[PDB]
Design an enzyme around this catalytic site. Structure first.
Site, PDB file in Angstrom:
ATOM      1  N   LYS A 186       0.871  -1.177   0.000  1.00  0.00           N
ATOM      2  CA  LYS A 186       0.000   0.000   0.000  1.00  0.00           C
ATOM      3  C   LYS A 186       0.906   1.224   0.000  1.00  0.00           C
ATOM      4  CE  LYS A 186      -2.154   2.751   1.894  1.00  0.00           C
ATOM      5  NZ  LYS A 186      -2.164   4.214   1.634  1.00  0.00           N
ATOM      6  N   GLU A 262       8.212   0.897  11.935  1.00  0.00           N
ATOM      7  CA  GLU A 262       9.291   1.872  11.976  1.00  0.00           C
ATOM      8  C   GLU A 262       8.622   3.229  12.023  1.00  0.00           C
ATOM      9  OE1 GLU A 262      11.195   4.472   9.579  1.00  0.00           O
ATOM     10  OE2 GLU A 262      11.534   4.806  11.700  1.00  0.00           O
ATOM     11  N   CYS A 296      12.525  10.277   9.503  1.00  0.00           N
ATOM     12  CA  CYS A 296      12.223   9.741  10.829  1.00  0.00           C
ATOM     13  C   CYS A 296      13.418   9.909  11.769  1.00  0.00           C
ATOM     14  CB  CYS A 296      11.730   8.288  10.694  1.00  0.00           C
ATOM     15  SG  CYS A 296      10.424   8.081   9.496  1.00  0.00           S
ATOM     16  N   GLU A 393       7.930  15.529  17.285  1.00  0.00           N
ATOM     17  CA  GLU A 393       8.496  15.367  15.948  1.00  0.00           C
ATOM     18  C   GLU A 393       7.858  16.398  14.997  1.00  0.00           C
ATOM     19  OE1 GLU A 393       7.605  11.826  13.244  1.00  0.00           O
ATOM     20  OE2 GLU A 393       9.776  11.618  13.528  1.00  0.00           O
TER      21      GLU A 393
END
Ligand SMILES: Cc1oc2cc3oc(=O)c(CCC(=O)N4CCCCC4)c(C)c3cc2c1C
Ligand SMILES: Cc1oc2cc3oc(=O)c(CCC(=O)N4CCCCC4)c(C)c3cc2c1C
Ligand SMILES: [Cl-]
Ligand SMILES: [Cl-]
Ligand SMILES: [Cl-]
Ligand SMILES: [Cl-]
Ligand SMILES: [Yb+3]
Ligand SMILES: [Yb+3]
Ligand SMILES: [Yb+3]
Ligand SMILES: [Yb+3]
Lengths: 494, 494, 494, 494
Positions: A186, A262, A296, A393
């Protein structure tokens, strides 16, 4: 050598890929795909839903059946198919890099020299593992012959992020296929295009039908279908920690499918007074600003010892003031746009807290341009630990720089987060390098560098930055299922 | 805590150990065993020859036969027997350390605190591997099920040196037994005694008869018999490089038995100007003087950067002038005798070349005492590379110190030897630590330390310092023989 | 698909290959190379001696130096070079197979479909290991950081046999290069040609100069130079057990270089009365007759249970009587010549003992044709264990068939040889398959098949059939040298 | 040798174990503990809640801190502590087996000879891994030194079932401690007692305080607290698949803690017509009836080929009719009670569906005795696949026997379940043994045996029977967290 495409790019592949053929969505609905740099529609792509995920899993399930061509072919031939796929991606390097740059807002030099080189290299690495996945023979107590098979798990659902569409597609499919799994992929709603091209290349390379199926569409629709599906054996996801929690929940409530995640980070660097200053500035800078801050592993908290803090900040601000914002495709341009509005907004809102909460704004701090989701590169100094920009973040071009005097204390601050994806340590002292990197609660620790990722290394998070590892020898474990076979014998001998 | 034996030591075990019983030599001949510190006979021991090696191998061969108790017992139970043997050696720690000190001229504190602690710990380490030795299942091309057995090799001949009789006995027998081999052991002629005691403890622990056999006697007689024997599958030897060559030759000419050798060295240290000076002096000192210089890893060439060379030499000489020579058993005594006359002579002859060839004698340089093979601790500075003392393994208490200005050049000098057992690197610079240790042609490289040996680590030589590794996970490979079994099947599935 | 070369073959490469350039022999001497099927000279090749081996080692030594391109390039790029070399060999598959067939007397269908396919596949397997060779981090006792490097050994001397010149070249160079070694290769005097072509392809692929050097010539001259050379770190040899002993001796007497040997065999098959009869006949047949019986794994003693022995022999003789002898290159031809006169003679002399000593000659038993070293396919039944043909490796098209009634006893007979390369077990009984294959003293044991060799499997001998293993994960160990690095730290944490 | 306790058993340890001291519940509440065989209260135990789980985690978190004794001690010493704990459990074998038999309704011979022997052996196995857990050194692209640490994860929540309280306690704590983790353990509410005794022995052995903490109480209270706790890094659970789903959900919603689950099964056996009939009957029987049917691996669907089905059923019923029900502690007694009322009820209700849905009841089918949760051993033949007893885990003494004619079809039936913990294959055919065991979707496949479990083997489920593996080399992975350290260097060399 930065070569480019002589001819303008044509979008060809826009449909759902199942059993090596192109399908319309079961609904017949389609969704738009945009260029982040212009806000202009690039094309329409078939919109995948639960109903199309169901066709994709049945195909993957069938391709995984005992006695199928994918189950029975030599492991060495699974490897061959993967090295062929890498040769094909290499052939279409110009095309794929352009599509990546245009669809993902990614600088073309980076797309061409880094992302595509990383795709090809990681695929070739993975191809090499295929016939080197081995079980054991085991000296069990009693009169028995015991061995283990490290089998493929089965049908693996794989949700790919928008920040590195090609590289993360290959991170997922390379190991999964190398191990003998079938996949339902996906791609991110923002960035379906390069995956669909790769699918055309999976067909060309001769993978058996149903071994790889690609279903574009949305996360809350096609993503949730994958995560809750009763005949998907494993889900792999890279993205936000928030969505990460939903997937793990959905896996538990559905069929206890295996989960690897992750997720984000708030990764810290610790710069000791003895460090190579220029080197730490350069790595910490590129560490937080790479791909418009949309990694990330963003080095989003930089702790610098007091006696070099002022000088570190100065040199940092100078480097941040050198960018040229513009179309990723134009040569000379050194910063592209953020991926989309949702992201753009969260970043500006976080930059705004920086000011209100009272960090020292050294440069940047607002939007840029008339079209495109461009944010000025931003540097905050004198940041403290309770500030939003120090906890959350950002996923934007926004650097935080703090001071420390005590090593004991800065390590506690470095570790005082629910995240734990990566960290950096800058020092010339052998003992400190080893002891600090041991004490950091981070999955990857760089010493005197940052953002060094390679196929040979396992990669993943401590804590809420993820479960499991990708790549390296170790990452390959999470695409196997171990079966122990124990056979009665009359008498064993060592 | 340095406890001692309340009662005087009695020698009990003096015979050849075969099938868990004590045998006289076939000739009926015996040989004397001495105390190096007094030159006095301690006892007589049965003298083993070819004829007694033949009885020992037939026993080992029989104990290795398919269907025997040693072949058929659980691997976990081989481990149990080894942990039991370690408990027994621990029980007799006082006795064994005294015998080691008295027979081998070894300082009692070192014998008690280091050698015996190392025996026990290494045995326990090895016990833990027994049921963790595993083969593989392998995804071979074609329709086949393929697996491997990591079997024991068979009857292993093991020749133990005199410098560490207990520790090297355990280094050999621990891994060999853990893996399921049977052994014929030849302790050094100078030091048979502690091996014979351990044999009494192997019987007590309940190893099946013939699994361990111990045959004392001489190298040119019982050693050569082992090395040339047509039904011994492997030879392990630790000792001189000269004898090492003979064994490998004899194995080739006889039955192509497997050979592992741990031989001498002329191990170098490189001390950078940025090093912790006191730390490098202390480690380099103990590095060359440990056990009267009688270690294969003796740090027998110390290269010190010019700007700290004078200061290094001074501090070194000071440390060397602090010893107290005497009986190993007397508390306070800090240096025992050399092992015997042959050794004593070679060391004095090498010390004499040092002078003639024109090194700077900083202290020592002659014998000591009226009885015992005592050599004064000796330090030569301004040594150069063509000197005998810089090329030849002394195996005596004799330190060589040289100067260097160029790192490129000193590494070439460090590597310019046929030896390559170990090396040391003293520096605070991360990059130098890694790059120098990579460039050294040495099996073990210590950084900011020296002589750090543990069971968890593989140990052995580059070049003419040895073939193969002992201990660690890797060392265990050299006591296995791999068998591949490939079975035709109708159809494989991954 | 057996395609052939449209044009006649031209010999191009005939010189010594050093530093990627072609050299004349230092003497200026040359030696003839023949076609075994015609006895006609094919060409002259430069004759290598000690003096040319010395130039080859200096090149290999230089290419191995710290800081060289081969030492510093990414492991992944060593892998790339190997996969490129495989693509090149694939490109020249027709050429190389023809040269192999013509120079080695090897059937072209086998050369094309098996040898070349095995070269390419093994090379690709090895390429995949390059960046997957890893050391360890080790939880040593005390306050230390310990890690291991699995380094390349260095300059590896590699002596290739004449029976599989291409395949054995790749078995040697693939793992050696994958691990980062440099090599000096000595192809068989009978078959230098295909190695010299491959060398042209190593240059084309872009390996750095000196990484692979090829020196044709004789065994007693160039071979002995390699085996005794003071700056060659390791020797690998495949060939006779007799020459094997000389190499190991020479290594011991010279510089204690590492030695791996793959030598002959007298490999047995045990066929149980419950076996699939047709299947055992077919595999045992091809097992002993493959490549004119010139395989080290020749199934040269076939033990068949009494109640099926007569029927086994009959079916065997029938299969042996179906061959068509002739030029390897002619389609339809099913048996080529022996490699040369020395071999031809030993085989006829052994066939003659068969008769004198009184085996039952079922077919064959003499030479064939007017030119070429052709031996009729020969089958002896009622062979017993003291017969020459039952003890000595024939390396010719000569099958021995014996009877047995007792399983205990036949295993003892199977194991009663100094050889131990391989064995076969034919039965339908699970317990017997496992227990017999465990009891056989053979490096590879086939169950219900024979001669199944693949890159994924380790391969090598027990006893005097060899030391060490080639290929598989395990084979890769013998081209590494392990270095332990132990670093002092202030405090370790698990 | 079945020895017993001379004196009556005294319950001593009944409190919450934290920091090696005994605590009352924070509430001050207590809960009763019963004997399943009598329904009589044995004692009261402190009832642990969220509040006591919080004290337990803070202790575990503190014991895990960088620089603590558990973090800094040698790995070899973690191993020592584990082998000491095994010696202590061995010392108290009589006591512990009696407590296990009395508290868990477990036959004393099984408790003494199997459970306790398995505890001791598994602990010793795990002790041996402690200093053999190793990371890697990795040949990363670019000029970098990269290594990995396989660190402990941290604080591990461990929920132990009631069916094997001691064995599952050791399965959890052995690997977790060996790897360097700290633990918070929640023994089953039904069976807290033997864990509390072991805790007294963990204190005695000298583990540092906080390394092991034991908190008895209920699943919905103390269990949920563990599963949702924000500072617990991993949860391990063995039990029902239903509760398994809740834990995984709770982990996702809380802190993304790592999850391993070992859940139920509906494990099938396939018995081929060629099988050893007596052997298959015996193993399939004990396979489903072991510990009153209360094993997750219960062989609860036995598929027997038609032509031997009648004879299989007959022999089965005969064996099932030989039991003697009674107090576990009384010698001669061969079947104890079910663990409690909840379980007792579900089993009777499932036995009732068997009848209604129309299986053939061959023996048993109701309760037994006046006190205790005793169920008659029950055998149903002619079971079909849609029956409750064929789909639902009974966890009771109830065997299902079905017939099959087609191997293709029976494998599909065997695999047609959401479970997949284990399976058995009974046949004499080599090919069938290998191919069927490959095709079964089961974590452990026994061939010609059943229920063979050992420490050397990984164990766990496919599908909804679990996530992850316990024990063996492979199981040890799930108690490590891998950290990659990548260090910039000037230049790498292979
Ligand atoms: C400061 C300082 O320097 C030192 C230098 C040392 O140098 C050695 O050689 C040894 C002996 C190592 C050993 O165990 N051996 C038996 C196994 C084969 C090799 C010899 C020790 C123990 C040692 C200890 C210290 C300390 C403390
Ligand atoms: C029925 C049947 O029996 C057979 C028997 C065989 O016996 C062999 O010896 C070989 C050659 C094996 C090989 O690759 N070698 C090069 C590597 C070293 C050993 C020799 C083959 C290919 C082989 C094939 C078949 C088939 C098919
Ligand atoms: Cl495994
Ligand atoms: Cl292996
Ligand atoms: Cl290692
Ligand atoms: Cl790793
Ligand atoms: Yb706008
Ligand atoms: Yb004297
Ligand atoms: Yb002739
Ligand atoms: Yb009741």
């Amino acid at each position: 050598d930065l070569p480019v495409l002589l001819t303008d790019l044509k979008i060809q592949y826009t449909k759902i890929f199942i059993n090596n053929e192109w399908h319309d969505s079961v609904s017949g609905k389609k969704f738009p795909v945009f260029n982040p740099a212009t806000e202009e529609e690039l094309c329409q792509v078939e919109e995948g839903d639960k109903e199309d995920v169901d066709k994709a899993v049945k195909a993957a399930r069938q391709a995984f059946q005992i006695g199928s061509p994918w189950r029975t072919m030599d492991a060495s031939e699974r490897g061959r198919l993967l090295y062929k796929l890498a040769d094909l991606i290499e052939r279409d390097r110009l095309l794929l890099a352009t599509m990546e740059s245009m669809n993902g807002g990614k600088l073309y030099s980076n797309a061409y020299l880094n992302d595509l080189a990383g795709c090809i290299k990681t695929l070739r690495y993975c191809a090499g593992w295929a016939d080197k996945i081995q079980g054991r023979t085991i000296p069990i107590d009693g009169n028995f012959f015991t061995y283990t098979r490290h089998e493929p798990i089965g049908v693996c659902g794989q949700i790919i992020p928008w920040n590195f569409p090609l590289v993360m597609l290959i991170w997922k499919i390379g190991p999964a296929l190398s191990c003998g799994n079938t996949v339902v992929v996906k791609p991110a709603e923002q960035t379906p295009l390069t995956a669909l091209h790769v699918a055309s290349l999976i067909k060309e390379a001769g993978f058996p039908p149903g071994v790889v199926n690609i279903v574009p569409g949305y996360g809350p629709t096609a993503g949730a279908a994958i995560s809750s599906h009763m005949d998907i054996d494993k889900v792999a996801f890279t993205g936000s920690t928030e969505v990460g929690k939903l997937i793990k929940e959905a896996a538990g409530k559905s069929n206890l499918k295996r989960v690897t995640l992750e997720l984000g980070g708030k990764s810290p660097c610790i710069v000791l007074a003895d460090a190579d200053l220029d080197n730490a500035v350069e790595f910490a800078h590129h560490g937080v600003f790479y791909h418009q801050g949309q990694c990330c592993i963003a080095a989003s908290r930089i702790f610098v010892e007091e006696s070099i803090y002022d000088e570190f900040v100065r040199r940092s601000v100078e480097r941040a003031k050198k960018y040229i914002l513009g179309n990723p495709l134009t040569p000379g341009v050194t910063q592209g746009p953020q991926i989309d509005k949702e992201q753009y907004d969260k970043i500006l809102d976080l930059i705004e807290s920086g000011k209100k909460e009272g960090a020292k704004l050294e440069c940047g701090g607002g939007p840029w341009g008339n079209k495109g989701y461009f944010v000025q590169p931003t540097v905050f100094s004198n940041v403290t630990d309770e500030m939003r920009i120090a906890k959350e973040e950002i996923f934007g071009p926004v650097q935080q720089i703090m001071k420390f005097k005590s090593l004991d204390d800065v390590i506690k601050r470095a570790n005082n987060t629910f995240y734990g994806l990566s960290a950096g340590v800058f020092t010339k002292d052998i003992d400190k390098a080893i002891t600090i990197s041991s004490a950091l609660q981070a999955g990857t620790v760089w010493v005197n560098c940052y953002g060094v990722v390679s196929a040979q290394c396992p990669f993943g998070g401590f804590k809420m930055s993820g479960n499991g590892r990708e790549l390296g020898e170790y990452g390959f474990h999470e695409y196997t299922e171990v079966k122990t076979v124990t056979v009665k014998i009359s008498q064993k001998n060592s």
